[PDB]
Each structure stands twice: as structure tokens, then as C-alpha cells.
Amino acid sequence: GAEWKSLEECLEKHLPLPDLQEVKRVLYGKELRKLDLPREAFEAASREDFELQGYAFEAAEEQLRRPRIVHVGLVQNRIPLPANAPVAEQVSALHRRIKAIVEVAAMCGVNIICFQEAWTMPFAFCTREKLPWTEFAESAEDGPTTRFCQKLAKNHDMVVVSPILERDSEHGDVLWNTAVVISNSGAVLGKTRKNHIPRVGDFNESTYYMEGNLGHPVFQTQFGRIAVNICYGRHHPLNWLMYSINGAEIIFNPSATIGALSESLWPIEARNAAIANHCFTCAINRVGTEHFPNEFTSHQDFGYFYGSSYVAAPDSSRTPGLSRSRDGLLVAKLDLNLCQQVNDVWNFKMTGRYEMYARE
Amino acid sequence: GAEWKSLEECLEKHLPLPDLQEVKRVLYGKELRKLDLPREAFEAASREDFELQGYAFEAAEEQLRRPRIVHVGLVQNRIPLPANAPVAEQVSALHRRIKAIVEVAAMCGVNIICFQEAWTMPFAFCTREKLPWTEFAESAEDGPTTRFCQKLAKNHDMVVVSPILERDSEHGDVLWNTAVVISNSGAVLGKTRKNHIPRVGDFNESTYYMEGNLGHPVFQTQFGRIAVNICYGRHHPLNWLMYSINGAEIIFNPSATIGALSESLWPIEARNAAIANHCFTCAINRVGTEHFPNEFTSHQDFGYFYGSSYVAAPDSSRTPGLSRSRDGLLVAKLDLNLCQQVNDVWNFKMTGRYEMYAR
Amino acid sequence: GAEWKSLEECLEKHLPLPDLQEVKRVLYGKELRKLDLPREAFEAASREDFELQGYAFEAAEEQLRRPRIVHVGLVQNRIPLPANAPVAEQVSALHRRIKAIVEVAAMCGVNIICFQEAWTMPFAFCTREKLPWTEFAESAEDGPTTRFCQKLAKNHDMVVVSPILERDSEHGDVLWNTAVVISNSGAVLGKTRKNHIPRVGDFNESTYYMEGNLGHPVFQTQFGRIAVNICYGRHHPLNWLMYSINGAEIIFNPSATIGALSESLWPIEARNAAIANHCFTCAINRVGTEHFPNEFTSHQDFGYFYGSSYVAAPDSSRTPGLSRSRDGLLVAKLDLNLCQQVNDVWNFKMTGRYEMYARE
Amino acid sequence: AEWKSLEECLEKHLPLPDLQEVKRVLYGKELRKLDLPREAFEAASREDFELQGYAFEAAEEQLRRPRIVHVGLVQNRIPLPANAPVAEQVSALHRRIKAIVEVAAMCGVNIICFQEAWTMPFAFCTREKLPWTEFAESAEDGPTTRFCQKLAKNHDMVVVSPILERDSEHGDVLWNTAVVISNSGAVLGKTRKNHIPRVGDFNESTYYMEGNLGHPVFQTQFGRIAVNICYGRHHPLNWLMYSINGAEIIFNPSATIGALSESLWPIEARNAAIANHCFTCAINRVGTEHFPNEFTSHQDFGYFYGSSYVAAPDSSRTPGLSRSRDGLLVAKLDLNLCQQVNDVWNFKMTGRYEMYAR
């Protein structure tokens, strides 16, 4: 499934309006209102070859607490250059491509943004080659990508979540799959490492780094607490539970998972985490296909990436997934007030006997 | 919604074959082969006003361990009589209705069967009335429903999971929402109580019983280990995790949840439990609407039941949901060999740092 | 380097006797006396297509403590059947092949024996396929191989070290590279797991198991304390140091490492461990080449195995390596009395400032 | 003693294919021989010292250019008998070292090293304080230190000169210290002897104590270099601690006698290089030392097998120098491969420091 576009587009395209609405209410939860974005921004989306989608999660008004509306952006992009390209050229091209989408998002009120797992480099862990695929790794706190992202952080006052490949040089020049998060002031709020490594098939990610010892950090931004969940950490519900225990409100899931079986798990695990943790969850997956001069046994290509980035809400509602082929950006108008309103009504934490479950 | 039929039927009805197949592969996982059931059995399904669906989960052949094929049946039925009816008449009518479907299932190789939560009585916890809605409760180990089920257990050699309303009389005549499981020999293998009580809206189930102290029992049958998960226990993933820790292979979820928000959670929580526990999970929900002479504030009706019973597999594949209106029976050809094959490949248990999380 | 035979044979074959003796004294330490083995046993070695080598380590007589002479055997064997064969047939063939060599060793006074890493199954971690290469794994405490080894333990009263692939079923059916050690009474003295996993090239061993949590166990036999060091644990000197700290006297190193770079490290790391720990170290590597129907990217073959099994001594002396092509058995007459005699003279433990090194 | 280096004998006897296979088994990989000036080789023939040049190959890095550093290792005998005036012996050794330095300077060498206490014959065996402790002077201000600084600032080569520091400011006590001067001739540091071999002829404990300096690492303009004294070679923990502080090229000036130590010579240094992913150099003096008096573990001090060599993090080593004639080895180090193999072979990371050091 590569040529086929997003599920929502096909369903809207074929079945009639009443049946379409019923299928929407069964699959995507509730028909949330589409975010009213500036028209010219949409024109820019048409010009820059990326799809723009805006949705707003509705919340129940609280007489004592005003809603803390936070606009959240999710960027899924392909590699504009082939994998067999110089590191500097690829990094610069990806920086420009990300910057254009950031410029389009900045004129829409977005406050937090996120990119796919290791957006600065093509996913080359399959080839099991240390050179030159480990040359993309640099120091997370001081790298060209980190400074470039800090440039975009302090001009558009948006929190940027940039997953990278941290080359931990102070402790023996070892690579780590770390996702740095910078505030709107461009000062590195933290760097979450990869807790879980997928040792399956093409995912030969164990031969490049080890499991992250950072644990489950939660980064506090001026808008709201945000966490980062790496690709393979998505599968384990305990990871999401631990992230939500520390108070994380918006959990992002930058991933670079291939199609097929993982495509079926994509609308399931993140939604279940959001439902069972009462915290907004975001799902990010890169689009396109990666080609390599060499072949790897689980071929020149690295399969197809279905993308389909979406954001789930604590009230079982989800944004429609983005297109599976074209790169794009999703703008979700989060209302964190509903996060704890549903948490109180559905006391899954309390009715969940932590003493009876965590102990055994 | 109520009139609208199952999602699979509508999708097959409208979008063309290539798009339908792609949507199937996105939603229902993989296109598993339809179970080859006897033709005359299908005719019986047409005659007895219940839908029959057969699906077979494929598994990877193991050179050392032969596949342990277990056929599993899931029965979702409405109440054939109105709620404001004598207890004996309603119980007898439900016994006959269940027995007919059991007779149809017995000629299809089924080994384990399950019914909706408290199939013997209409869900009346909303009315918050002790009489006569607590009169349906009897002793789980010795009741008319238990003996009737044991009659069906020892003639068709099928494991029967009958959720009932246990009236625990030896310890003060208190009701409990317990689901007795009898073997193929008709001898009460156990009775799992309700660990979680939904204190939400129409679900005024807290004013009838307390949380079950039985914990998380796993019943060992000659075919395979099976557990029972009550309606509200479905929501909490920790319940499914604890059930799968004790070695349960096929976890059933008899529920009587109303439509709307719960309909969205229906294809999500059970599938996620199956994926994150590498054990087959079954989902059962009663069909139809229940009407009462009295009104209750969260009305005469008790909303609509979307049914849509399905079985999920450890390899992210699920059977298509049953029809949302007509009562029916689903026959799933489970292959437990794939349960541990995917568990080994996806070491979610091992890569899941129990020391770092449970502590 | 496949056709070429053992280094010692070539050196003896070409250079004259004085130069050969000088090269021996430079490379193999001291010219230790060859063990006097029964002649008919040698005939059996000729008949059963395996090479037999006997060497005796000399020790200084102690007036108060009599020497605790322990004969040690090291078996290196190929796979007699192709890898693409039924599991039962391959296991039975390997059992018979190992049993024949054990029968030949039993008539030579051997007390402890060891086999290559996972001798029951061909090394197939390169293919990265779960089936049917994980079907060889069984329960370590109760398996066909374990019971078969216990049969050979209690009839020839020899301690058997059988590296296997433990399928830990009681805790979720997970494979582990464990090496069970049974006493002369045939009762499972312990099972050491694999502490270090080589995530390099063809060694795709990380996609089959995790690092062993067993730590560094030392098994006490009626003859002497013995430890087991898995393939990749050989490289790290800290592993050998920790094994020697717990009192281990004879440390075995069953490995299945491929040729080339590892061949250069073979005579280095084990000898250095023996010298810096004052404990006898044994090195075991399987011989032959493994062929697979499928190809794997770091081909049908799994390279060549140089074998060259040898035993090192605390006094910087080593047994000559076995032949690189033909499977064989080495019988070393260990004298543990010299182990602590050299330890006292060379107080590397004491002159090694543990407070100044381990603390930092 | 008469027998020459192992490599020469092997090349001399076995045929080319077998020789190449033995090379690939023993010396790792057949690294390319360094292309040295022809006239320099002529000088090596004239000055009665052997010159050997080898170049360690490294994988090209698109982002980091290779930091090629030429390293020299000088092994020399004592040109005068041990029973000689201190000044005459020191001057003769200065001239002999200076000639080899002049030959090395026209080959691009940046760092050089000498045998342990090259300024004085090894006389710790005799257990006599006089006149064998008269060779000791102040490390920071001595005739040998100033002479070495003269050679440092004219050929811009880092010089590692092991000496016998007479620590006079703290009670006139001798120490076996190895001063390292930069290319600007300014004493970068002085590493003391951490480990003392109290074995047999090595009666080195009756002359000094264990060095309290710890494990210093000297930073030169070319690269970080450490000094490992003779007995510190045996303990792998010493090399591990040196490599922990970031040392890239670890030198091992030693004056160990033949026999058992000859077997440990190609083993311990290579294992340290492999398990630390840092270039290691091994230096041992050549020749035999004779004394008028006899010592019980004789007039002679055994034979010195020399055989100086440099090991690399990728398990490759330079062939050992001749065991009889003094010589100089020029190794073209490429430090870029040092961390390339370190990353691939994460012995540091896969080495559970928490599980071992604790």
C-alpha cells in the first residue's frame, strides 16, 4: 500500500454522506470541528507541496478554570535527497524543508511542534554499516541541527521537538537515539533517550546504540508538560503509563516504522494509551521510501512508510490521519482542560488497583 | 446507528473491491481465511434467526510442536421477552434461545463458548431497584442456570462460559456479578467475580454488588487456559496484563455496555490487550434494546446495544465484528501455536522493563 | 585461511630444529612435556577422524601441599550434517559425535570436558530468522541434550560443560545462550548465561536474546572450581577479572567466532587473562564452515572457523593450538598447585591497586 | 642472544605464501611499509642502527580529516661499559641518542621515546647506592633534561626521555620518572613509576618507592600521549586507567630482561591496545650490561631482547625490531582509526563498569 492515499480521503470519496458520517463516528470517534486556519496559509500549503490539516478538540467549559488552548503541530516529511548523498548536503536540505513548514505553521498559532524520529538523517540501521551512516550523529547539546532548531525556536516562539542521533562523545563517542526538546526561548529543555530498541527484521537498531538510561523525563514548557516517546516505546503500554505518571500532558511519538503489520498497530496503541492515560498523545511517522546503494537481508529499498500522522485525545477522539504519500503538517487545537475532566469521570487511575497490579 | 448494520457489511457494500481490501488490511489487520463450516449449519443459521460467521487464524507451522487448533464460539443474543416479565419465563426463554445456538455450534467443532455478561437476566442496574431485579440472582455453584449449562456442557463436550449474577447466600445473601466456567464434563471449573465496577451514568452497578475479591483466576481446560474479563475490567489494561501474567491463553470479555462512547473504545481496548499480551482476546456484547416500565435518570429504554462481537489475535489480526442489530454466533478457529511465536518475536514482556515499571 | 593447518605444524614443518625451538620459546612460552597418553587411544583418534593432543603443565613441588593434578579435555567439532536439516537428526548426530570423543577421552584420565558454544545447534544468528533456528532451543534444566550429557557425566565420572541455547519457558519462552555444567554425578551444577552480546557484522546475536542477568557464577566441582566464559565475554578483560575474583580456578571460553580479525585476538586475550588472573584459561572454538540455503548481509556460507583450541596457564605457558581444519580433542594435564605459586610471586592482585583503579 | 628478530627468521626460512599466512596470524594485517627517504636509510646503514618504517591504514572520514602523526621509537645499547665515569657515559649516550634523533628528524617524526632510564645503565640488581645513584639528577633541571630540550626545540619533535629523577626538594630521594617535553622544549610533565617489580634481578624496590603521581596524560600539539613504566606493563588496570583519562598514544619504555618476560612482550601491550582502542608503543633496551661486582638474584645482567614494536587498536602491530642491534622504528600513526574501532568494538560500553569496577 504505497499509491493508496489516506483512509479518510478514500472513505469520503466512495461511501455516501450518512454512511460516511456513521463510519466516522465509529472509527474517528466524534466529528470534531475543523480548525479555522488562515486562507493564505492554505495557499502556502499548496505552494510548498505539503498538506495542511487543522482540527480543534472541544472541551467542557469550566467556571473556575479557563481553557488552556494550546495549538500543536506535527510535521511528517520525506528525505528530499537520496540516502547516498553527502551528510552536509542532506542535513542542509532537511533543515530548509523543515524550516519552510515551520514558517507556514508559525502563522497559524502553533506553540509546540514535532518531527519524525531522527529527521536529520535517513533511517539506515537496516544496512548494519557503521560508515558513513554513523557520521550523521553529533553532540545533542551542541550540534549544527541543535543550533539550527534553536534558531527556529527563538524567532517563532514555538516549542520544537527535534529527534536526532546523539553522538555521546563525552562518554566514549557512542551514538544514542535521543530527541532534544527546546523551549520557545531556544534553550534545550532536555533530551529524552530511547528506552526500547526494536530488534526485529529490518529494524537492526540494536547494532547502533543501547537502551536509554535517561528513564522517563517530562519536559515542562510554558504552555504545558510534554513528553517524547520513541518508535519502539510505542508498543509497550507501560512506557505510556510511566510517562503519564510523571504528569506529562501531551505525549509525542516520533517514529520511523515501516508499513504492513505496524500499520495495523498504528491507530491502536497510541489511541489506547491516550484513553487509558487521559493525556493527549501525538503520533508521527515519516513518509516516503528510502533507497540504498547496498542491499540488506532482514534489498535496495527500505520498504514504504505509511506516514498517517495523527493526534489522539483523552475523550477517545482522534484527528484524521494525514496522507500516506505526500509529506504534510497537522495543526491540532488542543484544549488541556478536557484532559483532566475525562480523567475525573473515568477514574481509570483510581479504579486501576495499582496496589493489586504493580505489586504483582 | 441502531438501524445501521455492521461496519464490515457497509464497507463491503459501498467501496469497490481494491479499496475495500486496502481498508480491510488497514482496519482488520490481515485477510484471514474464512472458516469452512458445514452448509446445512448455515441453513440452520438462516432458520433460527441468528447470524453465523466463521474465520480461521493462520499460524506458522512448527516442526517440533503440532498446532493446537481450538475452535471458539461467541454467542451474542437479545432478550426474547420483555424485561417486565416473570423471572422463570424469561430464564426459560433465554435457556431455549441459548440452547438452539449451542446445538448449531456443536456441529461445527466448537470447543469453548461464551455468552454476554449476565445473559440470564436483562441488565436492570440502571433502575436502582432491588426488587424484582435481584430475584434473578441464584447460587452460582447450584442454580437452575448452572445445572442447565452443565446439561449443555456434558452432551456436546464444549467448554461453556456462562456469566450470571451469583447470589452469594452462604456469606449473607449478597449478589455478585460472577461468570461461572464449566468444563466439557459439566463440572464447574471456577467462577470469576467482577473486579471493576463502572460507576458511570446508566451503569448504576455499584448499588448492587462490590468489587470481586477473587482476584484474577485462570481456568485450565483440556483444550487451553481461558480467563473471563467482566465489562468494566475491559477498560483497564492492567487487568488484561494480570490475566496474561498467570498464563491465560484465551481471554474472554463478556460485556453489556451501551452504545456511543463505548462503541469507539470497543475495537481499541481489546485489540490493544491482545497485542500487548500476545494472547487471544474475545469480545462479547449483547444486542438489542431493553425497555422498562419505570424511568431512570442517568427513561423507559436502556439505550441501544451495538453488539459487534469479535475475537482479536496476538498477531494484530481480528475477526470482523458481528452485526449490530441481529443476534448471532461467531466461530473462530484459533491456533494457539502462533500465540507464543509472536510473543517470542515481539518480546514486549521482556523489553517491557517490569523492574522499571511495576516498581 | 581455511586449507592452511595449525601454526605449530607449519612452523615445525619448515624451520630447522634450533630455530623452531627458539620460536616455540618466544611464542608458546615454555616447551612443556607432552602428556603420555595410551597408544591405543591414539589409534582410536586416528580411527574416529579427530586429532588428539596431550600436554602436561609442570609445577613446583610443595612440601606441605600435594599437587592437585586435574586432567582437562577440550573438544572442538564441526557439524556432521548440513544446517538445513531436521532438528532431531542434527541433535542426534551431534550427540553421537560428541559421545565418541568422550569415550576416547574417558580412557585418558580426563576429569573436566568442554565443548564449543552452542554445540547442539549450528550458529544461525546471522540469518536473523526466528524459524526454524530457534527450534533447537529447549529447557536447560530438562532437555534432551541435558539428559544426554548427564548420561555421559555419570558413566565416565567426568565434569561436562555443555553450552546450549536455553529456552527459558517458565518466564515467557525466551531464548538464552546458556552453558550448563554438570558434575561427575550427572546433576546440573549450574547454568551460566551470556553476559556480553557481540553486535558486530555477521554476529546478529542481539536479535535472539538479551544479556545474561546471572552475573559471574563459579561452579565448584570435586576436582576444582570452574567457570564458563561465553564468546563475546572473551574480549573484555573485566569479565575474566570478575570470574577470577570469585575464586574460579579453571576458566573455560567456549566460542564460535569467525576467522580474520578474531583470529588475531585469539592467542592474545585468553593468554592475557590467564597471566593477569593467575588462573588456568581454556579456549574453545568450533571448526568447519556452516552453509545456509538463504543469504545474509553483514551469502550462503558463514565464513570459516579457525578452531585452534588451546589452554593457557598462569605461568605464561600455553598448549599449542589444535588444527584449524580437522575437529579434535585436547587433553591438558593441569597442575593447580602452580596457579597460586605464580600468584604469590607475581602479586598482580596486590600490586594492582584495586582502591586506586576500581574506585575510579 | 645471537638469534635475530623473529620476523627476519620467518621471512628467511618459510616460503612466501606460508610466510604471508604466518604474518596474518601473528602480526595481524600486512600494513604498508612507510616510504622513507633513501638517503635516510643510508644514514641508518652508516650509524650502525636499524631503521624500520610502517604505516597504519585508517578508514577515510568524510567529516574529520585523518590526523597523521609519525611516531619514533629508539632502542639503544650502552656504548660504554657500566664501570665508567658518570659524565662520560651520559655524554656518550647523549651523542648516540642525538645521532638517531637527527636521522629521525628527516623522516617527519613528531613524537619520540627512549628506553627506561636511557641515561644510565640498569644497575638496580647490584643493590649498591654508590655510584649507581650518582646518575640521578633533578628531572626539571638536569643536564639530560636541558640536552633533551635542545633536541626538542630544533627538530620540533616531542621527546619522551625516561630518567632517574633525584627528588631533592623533598629529601634527596630517587624516583624513576620519565619527563616528556613538547616540541617547544618546555617540560610538559614527568610521570613517575606506579609499579615496582620486586622479582629476582629486578631489585628496584631498594632504590625508590611507588610513584604517587597517579596516571597523568600529557597533551601535545599532535595528540595526547602517556608513559607506562616497565613493571606497569604487566597490570592491565594500569593501561585501562591511562586510557580512561583520554590518552591516545601510550608508550611503554622498559628495560626488562629476557626469558619469561620475552613471552609476555608481544602479549600484554597488544592486549592493552586491543582492549583500550588506543595506540600502544613498546620500548626495550638492547645489549647486555656487565658489572665489576656480582649479584645474586654474576657479572652480567642477562641479555636484553629489545624487540621494540607499536600496537594498534585494530589488532595490527609493527614487526619487532632486531634483538641484537640497536635501532629506530618509525610508525605512521593514523589516530582516526583509534575511535573508529572503539565505536565498532564498544568494549568500554559492553564492559559493564558498574558490574565490574564496583
Residue numbers in the entry:
A (entry chain A), C (entry chain B): 3 to 300, 307 to 368
B (entry chain D): 3 to 300, 307 to 367
D (entry chain C): 4 to 300, 307 to 367
Copy text from the publication.
For this purpose, we prepared grids for the C233S variant with 2 mM NCβA at pH 7.0, and for wild-type HsβUP without any ligands at pH 5.0. Only the latter sample resulted in micrographs that were of sufficient resolution and contained enzyme states larger than the dimer. Nevertheless, 3D classification showed that the sample was heterogeneous, consisting of tetramers, hexamers, and octamers. Map 1 has a resolution of ~3.0–3.5 Å for the two central HsβUP dimers, and >6 Å for the “outer” dimers, indicating that the latter region shows more variability. The structural model deposited in the PDB does in fact only consist of the two inner-most dimers, as the low resolution map obtained for the outer dimers prohibited a precise modelling of these parts. Out of the 384 amino acids comprising the HsβUP subunit, residues 3–300 and 307–368 are visible in the density map. In the cryo-EM structure reported here, the entrance loops as well as the N-terminal extension adopt conformations basically identical to those observed in the crystal structure of DmβUP. EL1 and EL2 are completely ordered, and EL3 partially. The lack of density for at least six residues at the very tip of this loop is indicative of their dynamic mobility. In the inner subunits involved in dimer–dimer interface formation, the last visible residue before the gap in density is H307, which was targeted in the here reported site-directed mutagenesis studies.
